[PDB]
Amino acid sequence: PGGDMSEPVTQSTLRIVGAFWRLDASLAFRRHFPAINWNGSYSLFTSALDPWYRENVAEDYPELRDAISELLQREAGLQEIVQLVGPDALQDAERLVIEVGRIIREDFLQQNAYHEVDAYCSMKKAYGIMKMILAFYKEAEAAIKRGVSIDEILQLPVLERIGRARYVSEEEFPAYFEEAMKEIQGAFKAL
Amino acid sequence: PGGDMSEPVTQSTLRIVGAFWRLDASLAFRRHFPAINWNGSYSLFTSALDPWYRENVAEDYPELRDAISELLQREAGLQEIVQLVGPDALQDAERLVIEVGRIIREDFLQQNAYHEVDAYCSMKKAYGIMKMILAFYKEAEAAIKRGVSIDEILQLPVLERIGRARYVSEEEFPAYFEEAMKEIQGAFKAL
Amino acid sequence: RLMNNGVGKGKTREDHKQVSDQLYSAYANGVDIRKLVAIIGEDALTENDRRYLQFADAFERFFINQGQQNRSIEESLQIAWALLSMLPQGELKRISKDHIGKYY
Amino acid sequence: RLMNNGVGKGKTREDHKQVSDQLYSAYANGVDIRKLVAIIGEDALTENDRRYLQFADAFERFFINQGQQNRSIEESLQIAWALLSMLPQGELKRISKDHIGKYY
Amino acid sequence: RLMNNGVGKGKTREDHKQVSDQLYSAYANGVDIRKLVAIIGEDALTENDRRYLQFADAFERFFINQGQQNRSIEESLQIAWALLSMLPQGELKRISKDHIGKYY
Amino acid sequence: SQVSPTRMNLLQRRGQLRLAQKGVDLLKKKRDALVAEFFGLVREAMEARKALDQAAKEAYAALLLAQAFDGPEVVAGAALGVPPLEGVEAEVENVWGSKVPRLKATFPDGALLSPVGTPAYTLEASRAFRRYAEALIRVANTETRLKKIGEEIKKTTRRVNALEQVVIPGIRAQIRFIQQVLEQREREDTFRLKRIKGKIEAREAEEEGG
């Protein structure tokens, strides 16, 4: 009834049940949904899910997800320093990440409950989206190390394809995803 | 007791009120009766006093006065940036505004109320010095627009003349009015 | 709350759904750099980000200000696109490709 | 709160009432300056300041300190005038002309 | 707080004392660098200290991870040592020379 | 516009300090490094330049031997024969806030270029340029770096100051304000609650009856 999670009736829920999600307030004023703080939240159930996931979904999924949290929860690591001296003077393995992740919440964390489609997904679809980004991180990491810069990479057309991306439906989805699977390796080595 | 707007007695005289005229501790240190804080006010009749205004005072009053609020409004907004940089690395034409504003205080604040010059002051005497300063702005505005340094207007004695603005006994007010009106558009037309 | 009802579907122009969240989100995005600016410098922003701050003052000033002068659903919208105009395309992800060009 | 009575001629001496504010107004312009050393430069200042600087020191450890020796109201004002002395006489707005040459 | 009357030279292994105040104070020194490297790049780290970055990685990745592996006080002290070898010697000046002369 | 409210925020705004305080703790010992590197530049600057100027000038006035106006001649007769204009390389290096370029401008610039032997003083004098031009470049490029990094050094310590004693003692000053009010809240809580007990007992003292 406040916002102070300190208040008893709320808190008593935690530490009586597991799987806590918190829904940030200042997130949402902007415009996302059903955005949550994942720097508040925490589930417990997440290890005993591993069997079913392995088999049903993909055999390498939990590894591929932890690397997403690898950026995602680490990203605050830089966030703070941004607000201590701007994005200025954070150089390039620096501003790599910032931006990667920028997109990670701009596109992997915001659905709707009103967009006509794209508001429900299967794992295997979602799973897909998620593999792309990893790649993009990987090759970018090797982009700057090689001698070029993110600066233009951002302003590549191929970023926006990763952008709008979620919108296509399932039917197309396989092949959509396959098309970017070509587009990557060429669109790095070239430039 | 807080001197803080918080206790109920301040909140409750705020819904059965007309206007507000909040003071402020901080100014009180650097002595300015009244510690009226021109960022802490609001009338609620300057939308219904205009009839008697532009009929008796002048006709140059419902406008010319307000265009001074815009001055002093903007004096705030710059101050931050001044202390964020200095009264230095600005655009030159700006550093005008900072001591225009200064004068809106030198001769439009204080007025002890204990010195036999304050103790009734008419709209006429008011409006009087209010309008002089308005001019002064535009005049310098052209001076430095041409390219003279903003410095240059500052040493001019015509400011010194205006610093006695509130030191003219009431009767002989039109004595400095027009007189110095010309000393302004006159002397300052040297450069 | 009740808004996803009665809008656009022969009830307003089809552009509405995507209008709002974009224009919305821009401004959100907007004032945000109002802060980061006032700390680091007077600017140090990139020429991408410049365009953002330029729209700040704008948004508030033109559009949200209004006379007694009434408006219509359509004339409003017009203006609306005009403030989306200033940001360059490829920055508006929240709108979809057709609608954007439809009335750019 | 008072200090408008128990002042001037026929009571005290004609100059409390005057030199009152002067010093006040003097000290003020010190402190402002002492900020701006600390955030821009030590010769990025006018020299119209170097006197108020040193006037602030005089008013500082010269004047305020008084040891466990006494002073007397005369002696006070006496050295009050010394306090002023450093400043040029074209800046001392708050003082009637007659006293200005009656002391220095 | 109470742990002095723990591990001892004639109680359970001698050198432990000093291992403890090693890896601690060593550690914190490196966790700064891991942040400040974000502001100046890595092209401005001296040699000795550049290694104090790498220390952290091997410490964090392997040393405090321990999955389901059980260990023991003796096997554990060894590991530690090894990692300390990564930074330059003759420097870990909390620990006494003797021990280093028997382990590395 | 708004005074920060009355609960929730204690923890958040304390962690404002945790971030800030630790951030500004360390921002200094960020900066300590750059102050070291300033010294590296500081030694190096004038060394040879001052040296090879001085035998440059040797010949400069000496070469007037009867060349008092064949300086003129020689510059006419021989000049524009080793590159004398253009060769600026604008350089990027760490620059904070709104960016800044530095640079070295180096391109060929001093030797013989006259056809054959021709006067002697000429050749010798032009040889001084070798020793001049070149040397004048070192101080042109070290002394400008030095002052720029100077500003930075200062500018950093500037923030240091503000942060170190503007933010901290203020946002501190907010936090207390939360505390005392969060606390005052509950004094009344109890006092109010107290009275409830009084009722229960007074009330049931006459459910003893009789």
From Swiss-Prot, chains A, B:
Belongs to the ATPase alpha/beta chains family. Produces ATP from ADP in the presence of a proton gradient across the membrane. The V-type alpha chain is a catalytic subunit. This is V-type ATP synthase alpha chain. It comes from Thermus thermophilus (strain ATCC 27634 / DSM 579 / HB8). The gene is atpA. The chain holds residues 387 to 577 of 578 of the full protein.
From Swiss-Prot, chains C, D, E:
It comes from the Bacteria. GO terms for biological process: proton motive force-driven plasma membrane ATP synthesis. GO terms for molecular function: ATP binding; proton-transporting ATP synthase activity, rotational mechanism. Keywords: ATP synthesis, Hydrogen ion transport, Ion transport, Transport. Belongs to the ATPase alpha/beta chains family. Produces ATP from ADP in the presence of a proton gradient across the membrane. The V-type beta chain is a regulatory subunit. This is V-type ATP synthase beta chain. It comes from Thermus thermophilus (strain ATCC 27634 / DSM 579 / HB8). The gene is atpB. The chain holds residues 360 to 463 of 478 of the full protein.
Swiss-Prot record, chain F:
InterPro entries: V_ATPase_D. Disulfide bonds: none annotated. GO terms for molecular function: ATP binding; proton-transporting ATP synthase activity, rotational mechanism; proton-transporting ATPase activity, rotational mechanism. Pfam families: ATP-synt_D (PF01813). Keywords: ATP synthesis, Hydrogen ion transport, Ion transport, Transport. GO terms for biological process: proton motive force-driven plasma membrane ATP synthesis. Belongs to the V-ATPase D subunit family. HAMAP family: ATP_synth_D_arch. Produces ATP from ADP in the presence of a proton gradient across the membrane. PANTHER family: V-TYPE ATP SYNTHASE SUBUNIT D (PTHR11671). NCBIfam families: V_ATPase_subD (TIGR00309). This is V-type ATP synthase subunit D. It comes from Thermus thermophilus (strain ATCC 27634 / DSM 579 / HB8).
